Amino acid sequence: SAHREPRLVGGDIPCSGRVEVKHGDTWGSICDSDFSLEAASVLCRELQCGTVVSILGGAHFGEGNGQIWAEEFQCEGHESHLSLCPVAPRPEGTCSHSRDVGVVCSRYTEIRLVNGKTPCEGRVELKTLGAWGSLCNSHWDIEDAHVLCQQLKCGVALSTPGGARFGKGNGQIWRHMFHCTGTEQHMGDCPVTALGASLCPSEQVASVICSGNQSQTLSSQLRLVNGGGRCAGRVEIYHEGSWGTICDDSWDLSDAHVVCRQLGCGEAINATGSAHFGEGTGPIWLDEMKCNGKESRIWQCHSHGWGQQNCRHKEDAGVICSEFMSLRLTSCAGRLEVFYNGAWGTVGKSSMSETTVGVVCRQLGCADKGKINPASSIPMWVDNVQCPKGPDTLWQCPSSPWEKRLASPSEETWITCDNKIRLQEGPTSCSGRVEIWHGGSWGTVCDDSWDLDDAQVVCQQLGCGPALKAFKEAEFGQGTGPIWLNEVKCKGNESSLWDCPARRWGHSECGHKEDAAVNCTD
Amino acid sequence: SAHREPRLVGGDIPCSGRVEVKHGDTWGSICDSDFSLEAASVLCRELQCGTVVSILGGAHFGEGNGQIWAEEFQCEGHESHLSLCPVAPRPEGTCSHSRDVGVVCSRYTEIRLVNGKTPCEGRVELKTLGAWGSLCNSHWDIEDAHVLCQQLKCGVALSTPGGARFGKGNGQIWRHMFHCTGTEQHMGDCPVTALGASLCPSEQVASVICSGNQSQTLSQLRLVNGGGRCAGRVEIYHEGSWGTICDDSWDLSDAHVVCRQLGCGEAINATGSAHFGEGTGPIWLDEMKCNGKESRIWQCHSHGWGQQNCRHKEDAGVICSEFMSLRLTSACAGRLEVFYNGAWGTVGKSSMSETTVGVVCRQLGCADKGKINPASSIPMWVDNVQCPKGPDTLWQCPSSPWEKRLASPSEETWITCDNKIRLQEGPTSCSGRVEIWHGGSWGTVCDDSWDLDDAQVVCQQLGCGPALKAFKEAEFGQGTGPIWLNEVKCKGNESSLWDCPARRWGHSECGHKEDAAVNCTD
Amino acid sequence: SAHREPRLVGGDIPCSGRVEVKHGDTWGSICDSDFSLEAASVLCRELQCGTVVSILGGAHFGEGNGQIWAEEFQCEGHESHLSLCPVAPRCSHSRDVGVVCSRYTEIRLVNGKTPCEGRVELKTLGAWGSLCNSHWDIEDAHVLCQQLKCGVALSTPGQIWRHMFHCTGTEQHMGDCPVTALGASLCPSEQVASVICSGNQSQTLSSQLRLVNGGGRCAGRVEIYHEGSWGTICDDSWDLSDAHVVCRQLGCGEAINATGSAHFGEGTGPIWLDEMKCNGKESRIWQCHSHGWGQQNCRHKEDAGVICSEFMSLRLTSCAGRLEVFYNGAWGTVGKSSMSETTVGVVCRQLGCADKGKINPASSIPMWVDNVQCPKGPDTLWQCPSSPWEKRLASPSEETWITCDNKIRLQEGPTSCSGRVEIWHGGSWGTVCDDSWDLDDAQVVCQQLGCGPALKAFKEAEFGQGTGPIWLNEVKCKGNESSLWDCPARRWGHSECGHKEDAAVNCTD
Numbered sequence A: 001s002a003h004r005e006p007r008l009v010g011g012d013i014p015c016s017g018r019v020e021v022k023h024g025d026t027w028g029s030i031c032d033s034d035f036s037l038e039a040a041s042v043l044c045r046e047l048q049c050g051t052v053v054s055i056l057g058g059a060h061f062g063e064g065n066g067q068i069w070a071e072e073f074q075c076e077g078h079e080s081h082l083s084l085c086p087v088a089p090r091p092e093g094t095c096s097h098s099r100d101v102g103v104v105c106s107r108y109t110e111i112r113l114v115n116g117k118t119p120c121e122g123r124v125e126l127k128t129l130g131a132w133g134s135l136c137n138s139h140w141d142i143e144d145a146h147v148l149c150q151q152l153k154c155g156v157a158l159s160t161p162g163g164a165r166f167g168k169g170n171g172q173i174w175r176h177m178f179h180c181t182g183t184e185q186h187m188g189d190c191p192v193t194a195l196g197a198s199l200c201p202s203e204q205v206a207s208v209i210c211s212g213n214q215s216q217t218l219s220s221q222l223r224l225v226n227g228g229g230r231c232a233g234r235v236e237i238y239h240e241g242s243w244g245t246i247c248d249d250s251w252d253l254s255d256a257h258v259v260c261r262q263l264g265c266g267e268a269i270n271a272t273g274s275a276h277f278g279e280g281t282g283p284i285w286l287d288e289m290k291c292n293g294k295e296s297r298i299w300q301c302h303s304h305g306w307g308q309q310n311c312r313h314k315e316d317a318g319v320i321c322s323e324f325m326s327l328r329l330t331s332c333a334g335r336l337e338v339f340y341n342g343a344w345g346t347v348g349k350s351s352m353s354e355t356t357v358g359v360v361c362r363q364l365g366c367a368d369k370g371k372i373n374p375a376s377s378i379p380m381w382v383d384n385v386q387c388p389k390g391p392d393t394l395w396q397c398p399s400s401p402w403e404k405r406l407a408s409p410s411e412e413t414w415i416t417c418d419n420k421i422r423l424q425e426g427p428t429s430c431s432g433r434v435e436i437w438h439g440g441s442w443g444t445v446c447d448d449s450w451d452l453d454d455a456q457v458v459c460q461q462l463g464c465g466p467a468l469k470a471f472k473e474a475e476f477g478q479g480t481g482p483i484w485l486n487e488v489k490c491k492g493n494e495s496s497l498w499d500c501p502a503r504r505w506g507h508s509e510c511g512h513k514e515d516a517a518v519n520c521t522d
Numbered sequence B: 001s002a003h004r005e006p007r008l009v010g011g012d013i014p015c016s017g018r019v020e021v022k023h024g025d026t027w028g029s030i031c032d033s034d035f036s037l038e039a040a041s042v043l044c045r046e047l048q049c050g051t052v053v054s055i056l057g058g059a060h061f062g063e064g065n066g067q068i069w070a071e072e073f074q075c076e077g078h079e080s081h082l083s084l085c086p087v088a089p090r091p092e093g094t095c096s097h098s099r100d101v102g103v104v105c106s107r108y109t110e111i112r113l114v115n116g117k118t119p120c121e122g123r124v125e126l127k128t129l130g131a132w133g134s135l136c137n138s139h140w141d142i143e144d145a146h147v148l149c150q151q152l153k154c155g156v157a158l159s160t161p162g163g164a165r166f167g168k169g170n171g172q173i174w175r176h177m178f179h180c181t182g183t184e185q186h187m188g189d190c191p192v193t194a195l196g197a198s199l200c201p202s203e204q205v206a207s208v209i210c211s212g213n214q215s216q217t218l219s220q221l222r223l224v225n226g227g228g229r230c231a232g233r234v235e236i237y238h239e240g241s242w243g244t245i246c247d248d249s250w251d252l253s254d255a256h257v258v259c260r261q262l263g264c265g266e267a268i269n270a271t272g273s274a275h276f277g278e279g280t281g282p283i284w285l286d287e288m289k290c291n292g293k294e295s296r297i298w299q300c301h302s303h304g305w306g307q308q309n310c311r312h313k314e315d316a317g318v319i320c321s322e323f324m325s326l327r328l329t330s331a332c333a334g335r336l337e338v339f340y341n342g343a344w345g346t347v348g349k350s351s352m353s354e355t356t357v358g359v360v361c362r363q364l365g366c367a368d369k370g371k372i373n374p375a376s377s378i379p380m381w382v383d384n385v386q387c388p389k390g391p392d393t394l395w396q397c398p399s400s401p402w403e404k405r406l407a408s409p410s411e412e413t414w415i416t417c418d419n420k421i422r423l424q425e426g427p428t429s430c431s432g433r434v435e436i437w438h439g440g441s442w443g444t445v446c447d448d449s450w451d452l453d454d455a456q457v458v459c460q461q462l463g464c465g466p467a468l469k470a471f472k473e474a475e476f477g478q479g480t481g482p483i484w485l486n487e488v489k490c491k492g493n494e495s496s497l498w499d500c501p502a503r504r505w506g507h508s509e510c511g512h513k514e515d516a517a518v519n520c521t522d
Numbered sequence C: 001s002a003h004r005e006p007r008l009v010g011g012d013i014p015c016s017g018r019v020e021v022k023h024g025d026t027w028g029s030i031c032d033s034d035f036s037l038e039a040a041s042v043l044c045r046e047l048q049c050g051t052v053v054s055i056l057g058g059a060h061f062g063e064g065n066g067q068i069w070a071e072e073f074q075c076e077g078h079e080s081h082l083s084l085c086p087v088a089p090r091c092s093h094s095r096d097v098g099v100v101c102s103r104y105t106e107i108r109l110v111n112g113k114t115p116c117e118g119r120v121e122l123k124t125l126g127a128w129g130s131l132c133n134s135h136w137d138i139e140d141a142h143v144l145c146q147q148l149k150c151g152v153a154l155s156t157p158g159q160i161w162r163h164m165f166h167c168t169g170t171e172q173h174m175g176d177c178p179v180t181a182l183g184a185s186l187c188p189s190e191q192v193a194s195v196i197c198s199g200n201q202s203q204t205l206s207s208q209l210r211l212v213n214g215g216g217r218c219a220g221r222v223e224i225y226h227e228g229s230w231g232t233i234c235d236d237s238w239d240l241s242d243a244h245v246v247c248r249q250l251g252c253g254e255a256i257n258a259t260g261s262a263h264f265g266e267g268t269g270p271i272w273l274d275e276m277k278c279n280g281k282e283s284r285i286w287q288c289h290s291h292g293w294g295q296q297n298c299r300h301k302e303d304a305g306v307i308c309s310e311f312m313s314l315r316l317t318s319c320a321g322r323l324e325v326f327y328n329g330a331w332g333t334v335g336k337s338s339m340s341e342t343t344v345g346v347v348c349r350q351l352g353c354a355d356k357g358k359i360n361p362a363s364s365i366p367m368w369v370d371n372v373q374c375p376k377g378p379d380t381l382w383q384c385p386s387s388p389w390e391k392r393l394a395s396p397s398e399e400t401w402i403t404c405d406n407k408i409r410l411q412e413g414p415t416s417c418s419g420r421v422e423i424w425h426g427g428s429w430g431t432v433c434d435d436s437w438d439l440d441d442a443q444v445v446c447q448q449l450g451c452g453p454a455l456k457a458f459k460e461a462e463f464g465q466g467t468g469p470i471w472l473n474e475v476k477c478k479g480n481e482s483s484l485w486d487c488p489a490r491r492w493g494h495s496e497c498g499h500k501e502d503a504a505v506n507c508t509d
């Protein structure tokens, strides 16, 4: 089990850091060319860190002091430990410490229990932005308490005592709204939403009293599907052990209100129909929902009965709730716009750190970093957004509460995301190995079917001049992270490498020794 | 079997009338908005009435007294009885008795045996036009007698005695020419031709004597895809399959025998090279050297029972003298022209009732009714055409014998068929639910992708000006019959709804709750 | 055994001749239609003549006086004798059958104090000659001693035949050994091949690298053997030194290409070696500096193959065009001088398109080989003795242009592209049975013949009875096959069709 024991060091959040693997007894770094997405997934799984968010090569969390291992992990991605992974050691030189690999996993939450008589109950205390703080009890349900107790290994939660029972706590209140269903064993797996979360009374601090028996386990259904979020999508209901849809007959805002308040998504904005979020694959359970908009559950409405319908899947009902938040850039480059409460709105530029811009760019899936620009008219929704390290979406980023207020264009935020594609380890900026950003991490392109047309499309994507050479076999050096593309069958005139046909987004049989490079004109 | 026992009432012909289905023990009608073509087909099949001809909603056969059932028959179409179909009842009332559904089935013949000691023997009598007439043996073969006996549940026939053995006949003599093959169960399944049939001797009347034993049971050749009974690809049946001729050395002499076998007289054209389509099925007849005098296709110098050596693209077809075709010349408004004996000619206007014009319009497939117009150079074949109820083709209609003669311009038949498209349940004639006529019954257009281009096409096809609003989800009520069109992708400039791309003429997953509608300028 | 005792007579080379199966006491020929590929294979095996090369019909080796047998041999193929095969008793002497087996070598020992010892002599082109020891290794001596029933070899001390025998030592006969005599260099008169065999028949030999999917002997993906499984070599740092090592190890001269990226197809086996650091001087590939057995970070998409100096390929460039031979990594022409009809037939058959061809005048590329003299029996040009390889410039007058008759043909037809369909396979002109012979089959046949689309697909022997055997029946052509050989059907025998069921085609004029 300690054959290749991984660990994360150099990170300021629990499940991110420079990857160090212990070969028996010596802790040593890993070059980013020897650590694929599958190996990072195995590393995050073994450390109980959840799913891999990003592979950060080039010593993102600082260079390690010691020795660099020369083994390329050929993990299949389903392994439980890094010891079970097959590796391909190389006798020759390995790498430089300026290219150590770092991995960001998804369990960054760092929530604990403080000021309790028995070690595992008390005031819930959360750490974001480098400072501990009390969580608000407005959205601290018993399911969140159950997940927290399971994470701290004390079984289930007895109660969430409201008020300052365990103490108000010396610090500020964190407004994060954990949306745990109770079925997950870590608060980092829960969908948390801290953007614009409403202010909290000082004395309304969340707490929890766990059962304390580890052997004690939780014992026992509506969901929204294909909505591009959490509070929108096709209304899917569960009955007779099957996920079924609701026909959009007489499906109005009252029905949407009921399903949105049942899911904890606030009121509703749209009661969509005609399969707005895609046709479902399952029996239609309800046909004519006659909810008054006041009851707390959808099944307790005046429907036609389970399975009693005259509808098809082409008209499955779906909803868009008030708590449905969306993000976009309009002119990636343009004005940052957040879609909350059914209305698009700009984001305040105040306290917009580099981390927040990077989070926005990663969320939009077009860069790892970005920069704020002056304006090149809609009101401002949120302001003072402060993204910590670890969230790949803006909605987990604490900020001032939502306020529908008018904003001058000067103090809104315009950001230009960095290039999707970069050239690394080259003498100039127009030559080197092709790197592309997708899926949270920088990756490479393999040299299979890497002719000069692919070099042409890469050069015209970076803005460089015409392509000169399309190198193969990692001429400029082995790359970082996963191999996103191989067999790119470009015609040489595409607007970007993404439109070019290829075996896309991982699963390429190529290694990092076959990294594709280009030589553009200065 | 009595759970849903259908019956047809209010019809002058045997196999048509208002649809009444016994829901256990109470007789009640069915609304026309919850009776598709599959349910009508099951109804016709169960009642031993052949295939369904047309679904006539709106109390075509009369107002049904009693109760209306709100059960939407979800019949697949192949059920033996209506009791075996899925049922999707709705709690609310469906419609009034003014929208009772009616169904016309194929077996309208009403043929019987009269003036016999035993019920399985006597003079053949037939009922068309409300008159019990005595069929005569001009074309009454032994296959017709066998089918008549089998229909009457009397096993097989013995002989067809000539003269007035069972009586001359108390009334007038029908000239119908049944072309039974001896295998179909009912005389209504036989292809009958009574148009222009030759005058028949008064003392020669068809009579049949059967075996009288229900246990008795009987122990081929056909023309396919020719637009009639006496044209199309020649098909020979043996070894349980139907096969076509290779066309090689397929002369008019080889066509004379195949035409005289079916009773279609002499042969006009001996076609080939898939002239009537690509005939799927093994080819087992090649190098036909028929001399013409013989009366069987298999009696020729056949190369062998399976010496295919050919392709379905070289399939043999024939055109016979008794092949009949109909058209309107001036789309489907103009002079009535009938194609007999290889020439086109007019049709006499004398005794041309509304039923005959409706039959012509249905057969040409462009309306359910029509109207006689004044004249607005070819001879006249047939005159005094009298269509009864039940036939959808003009060739099953008794008429004066084919008399090639010159006729004045003031006595032929000019008809203008009704519009293929209509708007129902609207305040004005240019607003309401769009209904189209196809396949014998008035269906509706579903609302899937029913935009204003569709409404523009419909409004310009009706006859009035531009559209105002293309309605959705049965704004003016659920329509009658099937749903012919859905997902109509009109460009907005098509002259008629039939030019727009669509999922046309059935197999549409829509329901009558999704009936498209329009609003046109008055 | 003597129930059906076969023999080959009327052949110049040892293991070829007209088939004459003996019915106990009387020898009698066989009609060409009553003898299939499996029967010929069993015949070749029984007479210790190795595998069958071709079945020659129409009295290729003359007509044998006697009684022709009407029996039909339903040999499965693996029978050790013609007696053991099932027989189906029920022709003319002009249709007698002959077979050419693969052990045509006729190599012997002369001038020795013992019958199992002496100088090696070989007989090709009808003249006994002294094979010499330019490439006479100890494996060839072992194979010769085993063939002569002399045990194993001990040491190797008319005109001179320059044949190169590439025996591995495990071959029971010289005909089984791969032999290359095309363009072999001259050889000193005093330097000839000899062998002293042990003379102990009870004595036996005792105990790998290979190239596969190369279309020859000295090219293809490098397969190395380890731990009981044949594995590949990754092409990482697989430069020309590694190819030199694996080519000189296999006796294939120097190397022209060290191919990678699975040029000769992706192997199916564990990649054994990854980073070959051969200096080009060691005699074995495993003696190179590598990452070690099994240590590799490669896939099968990058298997390492080579193309060696002795790799030879044959092509015709316009199956008609100038004859070209690919030796030493460079394509080149073949000399027209002394181009006998046998050599043209061998060339046409090796191109896989005929059994005969006509020498034609030309309608630049330097010349490799000249004075090529193919004997009877080889089916490849590489085994035909000739003048040595020489890189020289030639005018198109002395170049070789050959127009071979393609395997598909139509015969007894009013036009060129009408008649019964006949194919060529195994040295005999067969006919296709009209089982499921539809217009798709005729389309394929007409497209292969090079004329317009088919008009009719006749049956029932429309254009007369075909000669020879029947190779094809129940051909399921889809109408778009380039050649009739790509159509999925039971091919080259195992057909009960008679000549009355010969298929025919009618194409456009």
Ligand SMILES: *[C@@H]1O[C@H](CO)[C@@H](O)[C@H](O)[C@H]1NC(C)=O
Pocket: A269, A270, A272
């Ligand atoms: C939601 O409703 C608003 C207000 O009626 C409308 O503007 C918007 O287009 C709707 N969006 C969807 C997806 O239905």
Ligand SMILES: *[C@@H]1O[C@H](CO)[C@@H](O)[C@H](O)[C@H]1NC(C)=O
Pocket: A431, A468, A469, A519, A520
């Ligand atoms: C890229 O092209 C430039 C322009 O010819 C050349 O000077 C440079 O050496 C090239 N780089 C490589 C790595 O070949």
Ligand SMILES: *[C@@H]1O[C@H](CO)[C@@H](O)[C@H](O)[C@H]1NC(C)=O
Pocket: B268, B269, B270, B271
């Ligand atoms: C049929 O034959 C007649 C002549 O008898 C000719 O006028 C007509 O065009 C023919 N029609 C076809 C379809 O061959």
Ligand SMILES: *[C@@H]1O[C@H](CO)[C@@H](O)[C@H](O)[C@H]1NC(C)=O
Pocket: B426, B427, B431, B432, B468, B519, B520
């Ligand atoms: C059609 O449109 C006009 C004008 O918009 C409206 O007055 C009329 O009521 C509409 N027709 C129907 C049936 O509603």
Ligand SMILES: *[C@@H]1O[C@H](CO)[C@@H](O)[C@H](O)[C@H]1NC(C)=O
Pocket: C256, C257, C259, C307
């Ligand atoms: C072999 O090497 C020569 C030398 O450049 C080259 O021209 C040829 O294309 C190569 N062939 C293969 C199959 O690699």
Ligand SMILES: *[C@@H]1O[C@H](CO)[C@@H](O)[C@H](O)[C@H]1NC(C)=O
Pocket: C413, C414, C415, C418, C419, C455, C456, C506, C507
């Ligand atoms: C080939 O077909 C054409 C037309 O189908 C015919 O005229 C010709 O005689 C045929 N050739 C034969 C049968 O050899």
Ligand SMILES: [Ca+2]
Pocket: A139, A140, A141, A144, A177, A178, A179, A180
């Ligand atoms: Ca919560």
Ligand SMILES: [Ca+2]
Pocket: A247, A248, A249, A273, A311, A315
């Ligand atoms: Ca609906």
Ligand SMILES: [Ca+2]
Pocket: A250, A251, A252, A254, A255, A288, A289, A290, A291
């Ligand atoms: Ca509702």
Ligand SMILES: [Ca+2]
Pocket: A249, A287, A288, A309, A310, A311
């Ligand atoms: Ca409904």
Ligand SMILES: [Ca+2]
Pocket: A447, A448, A514
């Ligand atoms: Ca590669």
Ligand SMILES: [Ca+2]
Pocket: A449, A450, A451, A453, A454, A487, A488, A489, A490
């Ligand atoms: Ca490419």
Ligand SMILES: [Ca+2]
Pocket: B139, B140, B141, B143, B144, B177, B178, B179, B180
């Ligand atoms: Ca009849």
Ligand SMILES: [Ca+2]
Pocket: B246, B248, B286, B287, B309, B310
């Ligand atoms: Ca034929």
Ligand SMILES: [Ca+2]
Pocket: B246, B247, B248, B249, B314
């Ligand atoms: Ca023909």
Ligand SMILES: [Ca+2]
Pocket: B249, B250, B251, B253, B254, B287, B288, B289, B290
């Ligand atoms: Ca004929």
